[PDB]
Structure formats: C-alpha cells, structure tokens
Write a protein that binds this DNA or RNA. Sequence first.
DNA 1: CGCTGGCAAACA
DNA 2: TGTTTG
DNA 3: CAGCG
Length: 343
Amino acid sequence: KISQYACQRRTTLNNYNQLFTDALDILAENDELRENEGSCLAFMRASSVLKSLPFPITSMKDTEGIPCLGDKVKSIIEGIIEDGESSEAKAVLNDERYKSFKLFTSVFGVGLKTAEKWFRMGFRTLSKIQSDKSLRFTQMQKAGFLYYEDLVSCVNRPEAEAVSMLVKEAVVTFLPDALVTMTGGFRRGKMTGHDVDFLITSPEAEEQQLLHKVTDFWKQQGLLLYHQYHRSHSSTMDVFERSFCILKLDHGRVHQEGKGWKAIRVDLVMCPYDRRAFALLGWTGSRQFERDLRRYATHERKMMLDNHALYDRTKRVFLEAESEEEIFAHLGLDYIEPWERNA
DNA sequence: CGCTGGCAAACA
DNA sequence: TGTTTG
DNA sequence: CAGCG
Ligand SMILES: Nc1ccn([C@H]2C[C@H](O)[C@@H](COP(=O)(O)CP(=O)(O)OP(=O)(O)O)O2)c(=O)n1
Ligand SMILES: [Mg+2]
Ligand code: NA
C-alpha cells in the first residue's frame, strides 16, 4: 500500500517519527561525508518514507510492508524502540570528521570536498580558515564568510513576506502584468526556510531580461550583496532565466537591533507563461519529491520529466499541461498538494 | 547477483 | 571540469 | 543500503 516513491505519497509537516527520522538523517549525512552514495540515499529514502506515516512507529510490526526499510534500517528502528536513543547515530555526532563537516559546510559556498580538504590540512575552527594567507576562496565562500551569522539564521514567515514585497515591487516596475509566486519550502506551508524561492511569469510580454532588470534595480539601491545569473534557450526549446541573489533586507520592511538589515538568499526563476506548471512543480519541491518524480516517470511510465516539460518516450510526444494537476494526471498520479510534498 | 539510485548550471 | 549551488 | 529484473 505505501509506495517507494515520494511523488506517490502525501507528506505533510506532521512528523510522528521524528525520533527515528533525526537518527536516519545523521546516518545519511555520515555516508555522504564518507562518499558511499548508495548507503546515503537509502537512509534518505527511509527517513522520507517515515515522514509520510500518519502515525508513530511503536513496535517492529509497524515496519512490516513499509518500502525503503531493509535489514540495516530495521535494526536502527529496533534500537530506538528498545532504548529511545540510537547508538549508531550518537557515535556519528561525536565523530571529529562529522563535526568539522557540519561546521565547514554551514558556510554558503563550501561543500563536502573543501570541508574534507580543510579537515585534511588540519583545520578545526571556522576562524583559523578565515585567518589564513594561502587559501584561495571562491566569490561564493567570500559571501558565505561575510554574511555567515545572518545566513545560518533561518528565514521566517514575516521575512519571506517582506522579500515577496521587494520582488513584486521590483518586477511590477518592469513588467506590470507579471505573476510572482513564492515556491520552495514556504509554498509547502513551512514556517522557516534557508532561503526564499520565487517563480516569475508573464502572459503578455521583453521577458528575456526581466531578472537582469530587477537585479540591476536592487544594485542601484545597494541591496544586491551577491548575484549569480543563469539563462537558457509541441513544447520546443527554452526562453528561461534564473537569478540567485543575497539581498540586504532592512528590518523596517519586516513586521539589540544593531546593523539595521539582514542578508537573505533569494532564488528567482523566470519562465514563459506556457511553461509555468512545470516550473511550479520543479521549484516547489521538496528535493526528495523531485528526485522521485523523475525516478517514477522514467521507471514506471517511460517518460522524462524536467522543470520545463514532460516527454512521453513511447508516443515520442511532449505532454502539455496548464496546471500541476495536469502533470500528475499525465504521469498517472493522484494529485499531491504543495503542503503534502514535504518528503 | 549486478546494476541503479534526479537533475541543471555557474564558477575556478 | 570538478565543485557547489538551487 | 534497498529494490528490481
Ligand atoms: N537538490 C535540489 C535543491 C533544490 N531543488 C528544487 C526543489 C526546491 O523546493 C527548490 C528550491 O530549493 P531550496 O534549496 O530553496 C530548498 P527548499 O527546502 O525547498 O526551501 P527552503 O528550505 O525553504 O529554503 O529547488 C531541487 O530540485 N534539487
Ligand atoms: Mg527555499
Ligand atoms: Na555550504
């Protein structure tokens, strides 16, 4: 009855197995660090399937019939049932390679490889890395270390709403007919997020440079702290735009103070109005929902799904969709609401 | 038992 | 082009 | 590490 695919199940923000999922997230992280991809993904798949459960696991008889649960994960669940604590997950939290990985990757622009590199070189504290005279940091890491305190503190709902006000203001000046939709975690009904995601669209447009007009508008106001611009060219080829920014958000815009503003990561995606459903589906997430939408489409339906279209391999035709509901209906899936995509 | 496991695009 | 981001 | 063919 429970599907091994996240796109074929409902995952709201009510997690009844948080004691089990917190341990499995830790064991996935350790296998990611140790670079054993298959084992990492298995712990990720299993943590995700327990989040979908409308009930908490209290006995091993509960695990029966649940996909993504094999011998190793069943033995992790058993340990939390008998003790209340996981011995395997607790060991990982005390590991020095893991502690450094979680401390060095907390910096925006630093991933697994540089965090492994710095640990190999003998680095333990984020201050020693910053106070060096040989390390060559990327523009992303220079931003990550500049705004570190504001960047590690999550974006809340009043902040996402003030960022929404800023984006809609900026967009409406260049394209007054444009539709601005909050995507990502906040569209899934989350109250906090690491960043704020948006999707911008226009039926009457000119649109080929809106993100470049909007970001130059913020730069003239001194609000563009960092920016990385992206582009692209029955469905046919793209018209697509993307802009990943770090914006200066004055506390006056949000409903000791000190600084007067907070650095927030803003992801702005722009697509043609006829490609909106695919973009909404692709940028609402979650990441697990997306990787399982792709997995299910290729393996169960002989179809290819991306953030821009859905292709039927057998019929050799692109399947058109005006809404997210039409994409689900094409794929042979029961519609999953954005707040039910928290896989 | 062996193979797969989701993607794209910008920097350096 | 490997690394990191979304 | 787990599922499929
Ligand atoms: N590995 C990835 C990362 C992201 N995406 C998609 C799905 C996600 O919802 C959206 C925004 O990413 P985000 O990085 O903003 C993540 P999300 O958790 O959805 O938002 P917040 O925590 O509120 O910031 O991009 C993807 O497909 N594959
Ligand atoms: Mg987000
Ligand atoms: Na990081």
